[PDB]
């Protein structure tokens, strides 16, 4: 698997603060804009919402959980994210077996204190809740990040 250029962009960012007096660990979206910044890769700004319009405007989407987890893996850059009517949630996607057998391994800060937070040993649907796991978006970057 090719994915240890994001996982490690992952871990750098972890510490970082995109926004200041704001530790990425407790920011969803500055937490991808950290990652993404590391690995060359544009990132659509703003909060978790407003990147989420972005990235449907400009991104390739995925099919599923199983599809990002595979494009993780080649070394692509991949972000799920899901608006909500008040705030939504980012987080960047890694290779790995599949939680449930269906939702993908991921990184994410959270506002919301450790409950929303994952650090590569958690996925996408043990950070989004049992509603909300199964409506999530998969958004890979057009070039490979890791050779």
């Known amino acids: 698997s090719l994915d240890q250029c994001i996982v490690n962009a992952c871990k750098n960012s972890w510490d970082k603060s995109y926004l200041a007096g704001t530790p990425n660990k407790d920011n969803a ?7 993404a910044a590391e690995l060359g890769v544009p990132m659509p700004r703003g909060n978790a919402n407003a990147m989420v319009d972005g990235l449907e405007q400009s991104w390739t989407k995925l099919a599923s959980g199983a ?45 919301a204190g450790a409950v929303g937070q994952s ?29």
């Open 67 to 111: 599809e990002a987890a595979q494009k993780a893996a080649q070394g692509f850059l991949v972000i799920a994210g899901l608006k909500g009517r008040t705030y939504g949630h980012v987080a960047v996607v890694i290779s790995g077996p599949l939680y449930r057998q269906k939702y993908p391994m991921c990184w994410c800060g959270s506002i």
């Open 29 to 35: 979206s500055g937490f991808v804009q950290s990652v």
């Open 119 to 147: 650090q590569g040993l958690k996925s996408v649907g043990q950070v989004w809740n049992r509603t909300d796991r199964d409506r999530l978006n998969y958004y890979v970057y057009s070039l490979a990040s890791c050779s």
